[PDB]
Design a protein around this ligand. Structure first.
Ligand SMILES: OC[C@@H](O)[C@@H](O)[C@H](O)[C@@H](O)CO
Ligand SMILES: OC[C@@H](O)[C@@H](O)[C@H](O)[C@@H](O)CO
Lengths: 423, 13
DNA sequence: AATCTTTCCCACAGT
DNA sequence: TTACTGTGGGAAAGA
């Protein structure tokens, strides 16, 4: 059972002990018909981050020298779809699943991915799910315009990939690596796509809201690094040809569309791939409304998502799997005085969890899996002389506390949320 | 809204 | 009507 | 010189 003090060593040393697992995937997948397989692309993948993973391995090592290599499997939550084995500085380990697919025998409109982790000795770490993924029959072809799920809104995340005659073997992905955009055969970037506005360059720019349409000027920005491509205009492609019809401005960019990115200064110059390098390619005109491009200039755009989980076995290493990790959506502060309750919303709340406003625990109850009403601790009892420096703001002067859920096991799940003592 | 981002210019073919 | 989705089918360019 | 396998695009039917 987590004692008031071991918490303090953790909150002060978050990144030393906290295990982080992140699952990146697209929001959509194309169904497979008959006996065929259309692989989820970009490949769903898992990043293990934090040094906590090294200390987890250390614990299991000591534990099993008295009684090795960690393996993981991923599936789509159906018992006729075989689970598949995942092959493997802040990043501990990485694996992608390149041959996942879903067949038309499965009738679900939505599914999720479930990855389970084990050590080679056989101790289950646990199972983690991705976000909702929508099954699509085929990339949409709507020219106009209800749904909106298949559109791409300004300020959301996208992957960009490139097939080569739908056959050599390869597919490559837009990815920034060491300050440069490249085209990776194994890793893919989640980029924020922005609708560029007006005021012509560069580092600091204005953006509008709205859905992205063909013909719009767009900015691609790396999640991780903050590195951006030059401002580009998005164009639909129809095999090897860029389309330029004015009417395309009425056409929404959509999941799994073939598309191209023309330089703004030069209509014939397109964002293009050469092996793993990102280059500017000059096209040849066919038409007032049509350009011939290389295969490397035809991209495929898809919205993506991420599921992140954080835990640390704060006391000992635990016998049970650390799954299912809870996740917290938001806070709701109703009523005033001391007797005022604060509620939490999210997923996989279990009966065996206690809310920790900081180093101190608090009175908690338990409604269900997606709700958790609890008392707030009297303002006095949250800081002292072991907590104070981490708890009082150095700007406002007001007290701001990190919220945690901790299992009786001893494992703490840092919520990512910190509460602001204002109410 | 305003966003900051170092621009990476791709080389030329 | 016109248009777009769903399902089926095949060509293409590799092993 | 055929068999097989993802992938994109076109055909037919459906909505
Ligand atoms: O030829 C396609 C095949 O017959 C398919 O329609 C099956 O009924 C089903 O999708 C298999 O799960
Ligand atoms: O996504 C595949 C699924 O089978 C769904 O599209 C059905 O075809 C439809 O939802 C039936 O009501």
């Amino acid at each position: 059972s987590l004692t008031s003090d071991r918490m303090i060593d953790f909150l002060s040393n978050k990144e030393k002990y906290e295990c982080v697992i992140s699952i990146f995937h697209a929001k959509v997948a194309q169904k497979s018909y008959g006996n065929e397989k259309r692989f989820f692309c970009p490949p769903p993948c898992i990043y293990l981050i934090g040094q906590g993973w090294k200390l987890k391995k250390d614990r299991v090592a000591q534990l099993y020298k008295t009684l090795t290599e960690l393996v993981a499997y991923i599936g789509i939550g159906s018992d006729t779809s075989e689970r598949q084995q995942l092959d493997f500085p802040n990043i501990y380990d990485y694996c992608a699943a390149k041959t996942l697919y879903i067949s038309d025998s499965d009738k679900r409109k939505y599914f999720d991915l479930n990855a389970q982790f084990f050590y080679g000795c056989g101790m289950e770490i646990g199972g983690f799910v991705s976000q909702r993924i929508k099954v699509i029959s085929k990339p949409s072809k709507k020219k106009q315009s209800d749904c909106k799920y298949l559109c791409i809104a300004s300020g959301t995340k996208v992957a960009l990939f490139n097939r080569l005659r739908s056959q050599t073997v390869s597919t490559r992905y837009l990815h920034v690596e060491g300050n440069a955009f490249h085209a990776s055969s194994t890793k893919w970037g989640a980029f924020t796509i922005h609708l560029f506005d007006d005021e012509q360059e560069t580092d600091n720019f204005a953006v509008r809201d709205g859905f992205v349409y063909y013909g719009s000027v767009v900015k691609l920005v790396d999640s991780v690094t903050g590195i951006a491509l030059p401002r580009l205009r998005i164009r639909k492609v129809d095999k090897q040809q860029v389309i330029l019809d004015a009417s395309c401005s009425e056409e929404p960019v959509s999941q799994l569309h073939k598309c191209a990115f023309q330089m703004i200064d030069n209509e014939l110059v397109y964002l293009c791939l050469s092996h793993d390098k990102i280059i500017q390619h000059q096209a040849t005109a066919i038409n007032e409304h049509r350009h011939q491009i290389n295969d490397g200039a035809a991209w495929t755009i898809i919205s993506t998502d991420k599921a992140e989980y954080r835990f640390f076995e704060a006391m000992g290493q635990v016998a049970n799997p650390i799954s299912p990790c809870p996740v917290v959506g938001s806070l709701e502060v109703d009523g005033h005085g001391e007797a005022s309750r604060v509620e939490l919303h999210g997923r996989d709340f279990k009966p065996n969890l206690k809310v920790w406003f900081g180093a101190t625990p608090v009175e908690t109850t338990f409604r269900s899996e997606e709700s958790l009403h609890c008392s707030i601790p009297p303002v006095s009892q949250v800081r002292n002389e072991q907590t104070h420096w981490m708890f009082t703001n150095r700007t406002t002067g007001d007290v701001e506390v990190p919220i945690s859920l901790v299992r009786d096991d001893g494992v703490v799940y840092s919520s990512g949320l910190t509460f602001s003592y204002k109410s | 809204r305003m966003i900051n981002a170092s621009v990476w210019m791709p080389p030329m073919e």
